[model samples]
Target: YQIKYENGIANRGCLYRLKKVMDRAKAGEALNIAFLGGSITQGSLSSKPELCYAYHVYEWWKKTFPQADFTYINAGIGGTTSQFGVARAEADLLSKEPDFVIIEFSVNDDSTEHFMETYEGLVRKVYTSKTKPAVLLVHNVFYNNGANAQLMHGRIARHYNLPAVSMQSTIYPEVVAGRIENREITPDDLHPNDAGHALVASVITYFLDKVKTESEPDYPAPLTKNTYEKSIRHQNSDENVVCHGFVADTSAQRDITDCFKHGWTASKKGDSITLDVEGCNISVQYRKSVKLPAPVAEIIVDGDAEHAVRLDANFDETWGDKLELDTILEHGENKVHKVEVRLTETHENDAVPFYLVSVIGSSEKAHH
Candidate 1:
């Protein structure tokens, strides 16, 4: 089909680390390959979960080297960013002890220096993880215009000498050259359909094959102050935070893909939740639901109501529930800061209760 997959390997950094993993694979060692990203990595637009590019790549591993054992851990959540990815790094990915990880948050992250820091933090967290997994940076594009945070993210990939790939280079040209229609592979310009995902897989596998023949991959910086790599998670429980009128969600989560777990909810006005977090960088995760008549609340840091942010559970789009992280504080001095949320509006017959996900900080204070 002349897919031009070879154009995708933007950077084949150090081949030493990957060669080590492949060497082990050749020896029939049990290995884990993980994928961490947003909805795309979760198989959002694809017809089936197995059709996800990540899974396709995993299958490539299995089919290519049948001797080695492989495990697949898909750590993808819809509508999240590298900010949350960095926080959940230990829990979702590293805890699995993966030997090779593919990181894709470029399309989801804003093309800004701030995301550069968060993305870098995620990169560093995985690289410095105890397992010492080999990491590959993936730069997915907004196919409409080939826009993404690749410029910023690639800086980190280059700095760390981690291998990186790009879809804008390989597939987008096919779309522009009239070889592929945009909708033929994807309903939206972002998330790919089965065919689009297959193409993406081919692009990634092409790079791996190049490495299969050649096989290879550091830290620098206080880049963005390097605070994001030290993130901590705080939940509704008093062990992590102090809850008041809000009630903890008791349902069991199927897996990390279940984004609304360990949450808190309230249905009445003035129902509040408060906690103290230790860090300059802080974020509060909450559900933005498509269900109308949901509650609205305000999040304030250190009682700084003047700069308070409104958390409206009701969303205009019909895309279903979204896990939104409000950056209440960033790049400030480290200390214990009081964070509070108070419901301002609600209906007696509200369609859905306001759901608070968790509080996150870039420090060691939230949890061990």
Candidate 2:
């Protein structure tokens, strides 16, 4: 969903891009998906890159075209904006020759004057390289306003008939009204928690399911063919290691001390510990799993009720990392908890964890 300073600026609901791309993948094209944006795209909260919306779309594409060979590349880097995306597109995205690219930089534009320049720069760079790219003007924690940066970016994408997915439209309104519950947002009411990531994936999936015509530029534009000549890594340093104690965030006065044992199991796999909530919310890392390629992790909750649980997927971890939630919660509550990890994708193993991180609360909305 879109992130914003207030609820009114949030987009009303899912956009149209998700349906667009799903249609393409379903029609039997082995698609290569790529993401170029800031830390959120790097999976700040997702356990690994696979769980990020970029990878989520990759998994969704595979599910839509099970027989098609799909390659996913996540070029998201923390503190990097669209400008940075332009600086590193060649090595991270172009060299792999991606079929589709997800561009999100509206969040980092210090001034709108150059937002499109850098954004279009990346898009033009992709098209000029003979690649067909889909533009998504991603929403930050607070993005919707009559004349806010989010709207401006959407306008820019619209100018090119590029599909735009706005997550802020999907949940923030309900968030302020207390009509919806998300556990991953911070108290400042910014940023997405794990549920926020899922919210983003859901909205994007809903939008991309509709793409049909693949837009191709007449020629590659005059943009730099940047490369990831050196590996860029963002790691989360605040991941908690004591899963069975009074877990605390030094900044927050409260600490989480109770987890229901009635429905959970802790499994040890070499250097990591996976805590699976009963009814299967997947497994959460007691500490960030080093075995994971990326460092971000997410704890997903289905609704206000805590027991509705599911699986975990790992994502990329970065400097700005924490177990953030979209909704407010009372401490010492026994609820079904599902967690996932995400990391930048480079191969198939990244896709394999999609199933491992799947859980009931994540999919079955009927119970709520």
Candidate 3:
């Protein structure tokens, strides 16, 4: 029987890695499968983590080849983009040495050239990791308005010749065709429900079945400048950064899951933190807490106060803490620059201190 969603595998690329994995599985070698992306990859809104697509895909591997043992690693953080993923994937996913990885961030990223570069960098980082794992690109569309970055991401997938899957081509049409109700699968137009998650897993597994005997995926010169692959992530652990009236958050990162940890916080108007970094694109990660009445801060690059970017800690939505990435500078220079985050608005009655998560210096390029 042909599944309608089987077409979701946009491109099979070269299944060389998958072929290697199947050979090992048949020989009963233990393997690791990791899911790296945003909230959906984190199993958000799903009744349980086990109900998420990542787990379901892991289950498929376990059931299809019972001779092999598998470990599942979920490296999803809600509201994060490839910009952050490029910086954190080394710690969150690649460090575990997984044999297979599903990179899902279509819903979290915007359709922009900048995201495309970052996404390309992320793919390169994982593809070239020590484990040499097979990478699958998963794209989830927004039910409303069909918003997603698949257009940009798909280009990178094709350029790299890696397998790519999408929810847009499968579950999306079913709802529009009146075969399935939108709310039945997803409560919101964004995050999926348990059934939706299962459907997502089914789509990927279906594609997997089609590629069992297929060959390999390789790495060549990237389509983009590929600046973020080796970008440096500076935090409280680094000594180059200077803090003024900003206190170090002396807490454990807990395996890259703790977004707000390993940073700094301040509640005074004069509080600030400065880091000297070199890159073309630099971003500051911060905690946008739902706890309102929080302080507001600004980030100045190379001491350019006139164009300083503002960081508002007060969030209007109630979906829990958001790990917001505000790019302070982009596509600029490859030389060292002074990045500063200063609190511009603060009150003693504030609910929570303004948390400056980390300073990421990417795009080690001045590539024209």
Best by lDDT: 3
| Candidate 1's TM-score | 0.95
Runs in model 2 deviating more than 4 A are 1-29, 143-148, 181-190, 212-368
Q: What are the per-residue Cα lDDT tens digits for candidate 3 across 203-297? A: 99988888774445344677887777767788898887888989999987675667889889998998998998778878888989888889999
Candidate 3 residue-wise lDDT at 233: 84
State model 2's lDDT.
0.45
Model 2 reaches what TM-score against the true structure?
A: 0.50
Give the alpha carbon lDDT tens digit for every residue of 293-358 in model 1: 789999988888998999888887787788988777888878878889889899876888889988
- Please say which candidate is ahead in lDDT: 2 or 3: 3
- Tell me the tens digit of each residue's lDDT in model 2 across 195-278: 667666776666544332223323322222111111111112223222331222223222111111112222322112223232
lDDT of each: 0.85, 0.45, 0.86
Residue 77 error for model 1, in Å?
Answer: 0.9
